[PDB]
Amino acid sequence: LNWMSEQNAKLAALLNEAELSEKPIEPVRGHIEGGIAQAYAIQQINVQRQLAAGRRVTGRKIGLTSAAVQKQLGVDQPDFGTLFDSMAVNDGEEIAWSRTLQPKCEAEVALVIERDLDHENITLIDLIGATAYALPAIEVVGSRIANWDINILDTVADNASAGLYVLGHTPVKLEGLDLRLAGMVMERAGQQVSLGVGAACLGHPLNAALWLARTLVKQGTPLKSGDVVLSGALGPLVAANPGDVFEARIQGLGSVRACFSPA
Amino acid sequence: DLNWMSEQNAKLAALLNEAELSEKPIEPVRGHIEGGIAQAYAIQQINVQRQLAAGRRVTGRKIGLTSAAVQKQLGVDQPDFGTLFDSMAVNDGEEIAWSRTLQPKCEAEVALVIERDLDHENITLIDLIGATAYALPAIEVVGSRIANWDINILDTVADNASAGLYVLGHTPVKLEGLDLRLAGMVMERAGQQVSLGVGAACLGHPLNAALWLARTLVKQGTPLKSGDVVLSGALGPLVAANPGDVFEARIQGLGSVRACFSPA
Amino acid sequence: AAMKISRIAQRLDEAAVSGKATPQLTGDDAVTVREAAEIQRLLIAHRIERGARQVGLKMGFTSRAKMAQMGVSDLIWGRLTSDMWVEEGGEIDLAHYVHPRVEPEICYLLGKRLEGNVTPLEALAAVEAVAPAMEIIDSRYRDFKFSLPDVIADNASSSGFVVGAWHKPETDVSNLGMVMSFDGRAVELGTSAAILGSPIRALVAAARLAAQQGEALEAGSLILAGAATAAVALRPGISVRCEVQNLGSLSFSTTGE
Amino acid sequence: MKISRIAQRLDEAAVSGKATPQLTGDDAVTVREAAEIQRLLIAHRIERGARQVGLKMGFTSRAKMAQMGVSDLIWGRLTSDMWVEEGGEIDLAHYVHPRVEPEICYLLGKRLEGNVTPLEALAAVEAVAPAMEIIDSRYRDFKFSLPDVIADNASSSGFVVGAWHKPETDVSNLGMVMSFDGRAVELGTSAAILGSPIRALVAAARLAAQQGEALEAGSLILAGAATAAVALRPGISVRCEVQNLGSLSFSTTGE
């Protein structure tokens, strides 16, 4: 009702300036007395700022997908961030270091949506019919806040720490795909930096997409045909460094490489 | 472009058109281009309009400089595109008249058939995957209207990215269940391996180059349309073709295609 | 061979048999890695003397992260024997154990003998079938703080093993998901990719380690490739299950209090 | 008399990790001469306690052969000390100046001898796998000599193999990505090995019968290099990704 306040616009502007100057800032949770709702409002102002610059909302990212991580942040539910055409990377493409900000990588299942989920009370059945295929993905999260010092208010206001998203090229339909026991390994320089399984992502990647679909319908911004949903971490995040090449493999889904350029 | 139909551009386009009709390559036109790569695309565009005026049909686009090595030798960090017409189309095994080539060179490529129009701004990989119907094993026969292939970025783009003929295979293969990053490529002639490659050589992946092309076409006001065929890029080195030559290209998991040149 | 080697082996063997913890070596009982090797052999000889036989091997520290955390430069292996076998779907009394933990693993059945410096290629040519498994591990020491030589002498905590269904040897086990659960709720989540990045790598290592002691992986051996997740303390009255992508599940229970 | 000292200086270079000059004028060798240095070169490794475990074909291409002015392939015997654990690490200090190459490896399940067809060859194969050859010329600043390369055992030094794949797997035209720390250094296809790897197995058996040998059961055959060799350097992850055959890797130690 008051999402477009002077306080929110100041916080949104701060995070936006941090991204442009490539210089992180002090935490903002101390300036948010409105709870996670005010943080979502702050995220929203930067979403409109990106739309007003002619960018395209290409999807959403789901965060806090394990009860362990929800518990550290004092929450009993996941968080969501907004993806844009500028944040997209294809498997193997060089990632310019200036596109990251304290980058970390997480292997996830990307779900492409082919039907709008605009109605209230979305079910798992609505989500299955609206899901076209899946893609192996590596999310490259980033932080506009200094040294990743973030509570739920900081991350949600900072677009749930979204940076980039790396997607694979070969789609795989849900029929004949077991996303619960799908094994995950992410490697860097032949080393296993992240280990996981589909079940780690809220029990199943569709449990997270179903959570998001309904959260978005209550925020007045539902999922749309063509949107890519990054369903959540399959394993722990690994901090990325210039020139790093992480390769994630999801059993039955495929592989994807995030290549960071140096300097 | 605000002046893509300049008197200078028309002269260069007619020069290249004439070089092709008389089967006689001309000298490099890079000296005459001062507007850079944009002026070169306006020149390719004039010749496109010339072909449409003769009742020809645009059937797709070709992508060149799909490797960083080749990009570097032309002073650029991006690929180029050319326009394909129905008259350039060849089927697997069909005899190719020598008159239809000009300094012919062969390259194995992945052909992508489009089934949806990508007319909007900020086309994503998701849009492209949804607009790709299937793929065919292809052999591009490039040609130069500039003599002895003495070309720079301006000569090739202006000369329709050195496009020639495109030989397509007959059997479609859907993308789901097709690994184009690791697909092996071999092109043989008289039992010899004349070109070797993999899908990754084409800008990392054929859909990487096709996403570049779709995006560039929207910025030039000529988007990819349904039915268009995208010659995504070389999976290996170019081999000069000679009369009577038969080139076979195999793309593991995609199929094979033969380019047979007539004996002139 | 030494009086200390015999004294520690016998002390470690009764801890195992009684299910009561025994103290670690400090100063007088301080042991060489080479001393631990001899204690490891005598510890197994005690079991063979009671009628059990050697039936396989288990690899320990099967990840560079693991060797890094314990400051080691190679993995540790343990010998498995007919008496550590647990019926799949069976029950175990925690009373015959000191403080047992459960780990999910990938198991290989050798169809032919495997010896020496082998390629992954050659390793799987001698494999008959593959299966998911759970290793029950038990450090027999009391108030244990990590010392490499103690675990070698304590047979790398070998104590129990349970295996699942037969699967073709060409099954891809490089990155299968794994869910270990107590009473149906997951206690550990991971992938078989945790075992050296590719489980066959552990089978190659087992031939390497066994050749060091002039041994070989004989036809019919059960090789536990390594732990895909961290071990979990077992409790009484629980159903322990291991579910693996493309491999089915395996289970066993613990007696009630 | 001469052959024994060339063999020993060549052998010296390998255990030492230090380069040695090419065979010149006085020590100049004949293909035949180079043949005995190679046999004696392996004899030194045997003496040290290693055994012959396979073969490696070189110049496995008509282009590579014509480029070196030869009409046939060359090979080198593989010994157990050249084995490198897959996922392992190597110290470059033990090498004079080594390069890596991606190949196809066949594990022979039965003896193969003589002039065989492609059909008979694969009937003797237990499995196939992707592989990487670690090559190392012992010569310092080498100006190509056929006899030196033969006498230097086709620069054989290291070899690593990937996972078991069924022997009927079509390995005729598989994509190969050899990379250093996740970035490709070489891009190719298995089609590079003579136009079909099974042809290198055929040639491997024709060449072994040339010297009264045979491809024994359980041997390892490295069909050939599908791409150009890339020089190795410290602290790098080396991986070979092959279409339908998975990948294999090994590291180099840092300074």
Angle at alpha carbon of residue B220, lines to B214 and B222, rounded to 5°: 65
How large is the C-alpha radius of gyration of chain C?
A: 17
Q: Which two three-digit tokens encode residue A109?
A: 């299942």
User: For the CA atoms of B233, B239, B241, B244, what is the dihedral angle to 10 degrees?
Assistant: -110
Q: Which amino acid is at C124?
A: L
Identify the helix (H) or strand (E) that includes residue B240. strand B239-240
Secondary structure string (H, E, C) spanning C199-216? CHHHHHHHHHHHHHCCCC
Instruction: Give the residue on D whose Cα is nearest the Cα of C205.
Output: D85
**Alpha-carbon gap, residue C40 to C210, rounded angstroms:** 13
Contact A232, A78 (CB under 8 A): yes
Identify the helix (H) or strand (E) that includes residue D99. strand D99-108
Nearest in space to A102 (alpha carbons), one of A152, A155, A62, A153: A155
Q: Residues of A141-177 as b/e, b for ≥16 C-beta within 10 angstroms?
A: bbbbbeebebbbbbbbbbbbbbbbbbbbbbbbebeeb
Contact C149, A224 (CB under 8 A): no
**Alpha-carbon gap, residue C139 to D44, rounded angstroms:** 47
**Alpha-carbon gap, residue B48 to B36, rounded angstroms:** 19
Kindly write down the DSSP assignment for every residue of B32-89, as one continuous string: G--SHHHHHHHHHHHHHHHHHHTT--EEEEEEE--SHHHHHTTT-SS-EEEEEEGGGE
> What subunits make at least 3 CB pairs under 8 angstroms with B?
A, D
**Alpha-carbon gap, residue A63 to D169, rounded angstroms:** 42
**DSSP 3-state assignment of D65?**
helix
Identify the helix (H) or strand (E) that includes residue A196. strand A191-197
- Helix then strand count (H, E) for chain D reads 6, 12
Query: What are the φ and ψ backbone dihedral angles of D118, each rounded to 5 degrees?
Result: -60, -35
Angle at alpha carbon of residue B190, lines to B186 and B191, rounded to 5°: 55
- Chain A residue numbers with beta carbons less than 8 Å from the beta carbon of C193 are 183-185, 192, 195, 249
Number of A/C CB contacts below 8 angstroms equals 68
- Chain A residue numbers with beta carbons less than 8 Å from the beta carbon of B201 are none
**Alpha-carbon gap, residue D28 to C46, rounded angstroms:** 65
10 Å Cβ neighbour count for A53? Answer: 9
Q: Which two three-digit tokens encode residue B38?
A: 């944009």
Query: What are the φ and ψ backbone dihedral angles of B12, each rounded to 5 degrees?
Result: -65, -40
**Alpha-carbon gap, residue A223 to A59, rounded angstroms:** 7
Check C197 against A190: CB less than 8 A apart: yes
Query: What are the φ and ψ backbone dihedral angles of A27, each rounded to 5 degrees?
Result: -55, 150
Check C177 against A249: CB less than 8 A apart: no
Check C125 against D129: CB less than 8 A apart: no
D189 close to B (CB below 8 A): yes
**Alpha-carbon gap, residue C53 to A222, rounded angstroms:** 64
- Chain C residue numbers with beta carbons less than 8 Å from the beta carbon of A187 are 197
Contact A187, A246 (CB under 8 A): yes
Closest CB from C177, C192, C246 relative to A198? C177
Contact C118, D126 (CB under 8 A): no
Kindly write down the DSSP assignment for every residue of A103-145, as one continuous string: -EEEEEEEEEE-S-B-SSS--HHHHHHTEEEEEEEEEEE--SB
Instruction: Output the CA torsion sign for B63, B64, B69, B72.
Output: negative
Nearest in space to B134 (alpha carbons), one of B64, B225, B53, B229: B229
Contact D114, D124 (CB under 8 A): no
Check C63 against A198: CB less than 8 A apart: no
Nearest in space to B32 (alpha carbons), one of B56, B6, B66, B58: B6
Q: Which amino acid is at B216?
A: T
Q: Is A33 exposed, middle or buried (0-12, 13-18, 19+ CB in 10 A)?
A: exposed
- Chain D residue numbers with beta carbons less than 8 Å from the beta carbon of B188 are 195
Number of A/B CB contacts below 8 angstroms equals 53
Q: Do chains B and A touch (3 or more CB pairs under 8 A)?
A: yes
D242 close to B (CB below 8 A): yes
**Resolution for the entry shown, Å:** 2.5
Q: Which two three-digit tokens encode residue D1?
A: 């008399």
Identify the helix (H) or strand (E) that includes residue C45. helix C33-49
Closest CB from C63, C186, C191 relative to A183? C191
Nearest in space to A215 (alpha carbons), one of A109, A52, A51, A78: A78
**Alpha-carbon gap, residue D44 to D52, rounded angstroms:** 11
Contact B50, B13 (CB under 8 A): yes
Instruction: Give the residue on D whose Cα is nearest the Cα of B189.
Output: D195
Q: Which two three-digit tokens encode residue B68?
A: 């960083």
Q: CA of D27 to nearest chain A CA: how many angstroms apart?
A: 44
Contact D177, A92 (CB under 8 A): no
Nearest in space to B259 (alpha carbons), one of B64, B91, B111: B91
**Alpha-carbon gap, residue B249 to B197, rounded angstroms:** 10
Do you know the residue count of chain C? 257
Check A56 against B129: CB less than 8 A apart: no
Q: Is A189 left (phi over 0), alpha (psi -120 to 50) or beta?
A: left
Contact D80, D49 (CB under 8 A): no
Q: Which amino acid is at A244?
A: D
Which residues does A contribute to its contact with B (CB < 8 Å)?
54-56, 58, 85, 88, 90-93, 112, 133, 167, 169-173, 226, 228
Nearest in space to A141 (alpha carbons), one of A168, A104, A108, A166: A104
CA B242 to each of CA B56, B141, B148, B193: distance values in angstroms, whole numbers, following the listed order: 27, 12, 14, 16
- CB neighbours of C229 closer than 8 A, spacing ≥ 6? C103, C104, C178, C180, C188, C189, C190, C194
A25 close to D (CB below 8 A): no
Express the helix, strand and coil content of chain B in percent, nearest 5 each.
30, 30, 35
D246 close to B (CB below 8 A): no
Contact D220, D53 (CB under 8 A): yes
Q: What does DSSP say about strands B95-96 and B105-114: parallel, antiparallel, or unpaired?
A: unpaired
Nearest in space to A41 (alpha carbons), one of A66, A65, A67, A6: A6
C177 close to A (CB below 8 A): yes
Contact A157, A32 (CB under 8 A): yes
A75 close to C (CB below 8 A): no
Instruction: Give the residue on D whose Cα is nearest the Cα of A255.
Output: D246
User: For the CA atoms of C161, C165, C167, C171, what is the dihedral angle to 10 degrees?
Assistant: -60
Q: CA of A43 to nearest chain B CA: how many angstroms apart?
A: 22
CA D152 to chain centre: 12
Contact C130, C168 (CB under 8 A): yes
**Alpha-carbon gap, residue C191 to A235, rounded angstroms:** 10
CA D183 to each of CA A95, A173, C241: distance values in angstroms, whole numbers, following the listed order: 13, 30, 41
**Alpha-carbon gap, residue D15 to D29, rounded angstroms:** 22
**Alpha-carbon gap, residue C48 to C42, rounded angstroms:** 10
Do you know the residue count of chain B? 264
CA D242 to each of CA A23, D38, D161: distance values in angstroms, whole numbers, following the listed order: 41, 31, 12
Long-range contacts of D140-145 (CB under 8 A, 24+ apart): D140/D19, D140/D20, D140/D21, D140/D96, D141/D19, D142/D22, D143/D22, D144/D68, D145/D22, D145/D23
Q: Which two three-digit tokens encode residue C10?
A: 């016998």
Instruction: Give the residue on D whose Cα is nearest the Cα of A247.
Output: D182
Contact D133, D155 (CB under 8 A): no
Number of B/D CB contacts below 8 angstroms equals 71
CA D66 to each of CA A100, D5, D61, D62, D70: distance values in angstroms, whole numbers, following the listed order: 49, 31, 9, 6, 6
**Alpha-carbon gap, residue B157 to A207, rounded angstroms:** 50
Closest CB from C116, C121, C200 relative to D107? C121
**Alpha-carbon gap, residue C62 to C106, rounded angstroms:** 12
**Alpha-carbon gap, residue B162 to B158, rounded angstroms:** 8
User: For the CA atoms of C247, C181, C106, C131, what is the dihedral angle to 10 degrees?
Assistant: -40
Q: Do chains D and A touch (3 or more CB pairs under 8 A)?
A: yes
Kindly write down the DSSP assignment for every residue of B181-232, as one continuous string: TTBEEEEEETTEEEEEEEGGGTTTSHHHHHHHHHHHHHHTT--B-TT-EEEE
**DSSP 3-state assignment of A222?**
coil
Contact C239, C184 (CB under 8 A): yes
Express the helix, strand and coil content of chain D in percent, nearest 5 each.
30, 30, 40
Check D175 against B193: CB less than 8 A apart: no
**Alpha-carbon gap, residue A121 to A106, rounded angstroms:** 30
**Alpha-carbon gap, residue B188 to D247, rounded angstroms:** 27
Express the helix, strand and coil content of chain A in percent, nearest 5 each.
30, 30, 35
Contact C56, C221 (CB under 8 A): yes
Q: CA of D64 to nearest chain B CA: how many angstroms apart?
A: 11
Q: Residues of D49-66 as b/e, b for ≥16 C-beta within 10 angstroms?
A: ebeebbbbbbbbbeebbe
Query: What are the φ and ψ backbone dihedral angles of C176, each rounded to 5 degrees?
Result: -90, 140
Check B181 against A172: CB less than 8 A apart: no
**Alpha-carbon gap, residue A184 to A174, rounded angstroms:** 17
Technique of determination? X-ray
Check A192 against C190: CB less than 8 A apart: no
- CB neighbours of D20 closer than 8 A, spacing ≥ 6? D9, D10, D12, D13, D138, D139, D140
Nearest in space to A220 (alpha carbons), one of A11, A31, A41: A41
Q: CA of A95 to nearest chain D CA: how many angstroms apart?
A: 13
> What subunits make at least 3 CB pairs under 8 angstroms with D?
A, B, C
CA D139 to each of CA D11, D20, D33: distance values in angstroms, whole numbers, following the listed order: 11, 5, 17
Contact A28, A154 (CB under 8 A): yes
**Alpha-carbon gap, residue D33 to D98, rounded angstroms:** 25
Do you know the residue count of chain A? 263
A261 close to D (CB below 8 A): no
In sequence order, which ranges of chain D are alpha helices (DSSP H)?
A: 2-16, 31-47, 62-67, 118-123, 146-151, 197-209
Angle at alpha carbon of residue D205, lines to D204 and D209, rounded to 5°: 120
Nearest in space to D35 (alpha carbons), one of D195, D158, D151: D151
Instruction: State the first-to-last Cα distance of chain C, in angstroms, to the nearest integer.
Output: 42
β-bridge partners, B26: B146
Q: CA of B227 to nearest chain A CA: how many angstroms apart?
A: 21
Which residue shows structure tokens 């609206």? A130
**DSSP 3-state assignment of C253?**
strand
CA D243 to each of CA B94, C48, D12, D174, D228: distance values in angstroms, whole numbers, following the listed order: 31, 48, 39, 5, 18
Instruction: Give the residue on B whose Cα is nearest the Cα of A168.
Output: B125
Query: What are the φ and ψ backbone dihedral angles of A16, each rounded to 5 degrees?
Result: -65, -45
- Chain C residue numbers with beta carbons less than 8 Å from the beta carbon of A249 are 175, 193
Name the DSSP class of A199: G
**Alpha-carbon gap, residue A28 to A143, rounded angstroms:** 12
Instruction: Output the CA torsion sign for A129, A132, A136, A142.
Output: negative
Name the DSSP class of D110: S
Contact B46, B13 (CB under 8 A): yes
Closest CB from B124, B129, B176 relative to A58? B124
Contact B197, D190 (CB under 8 A): no
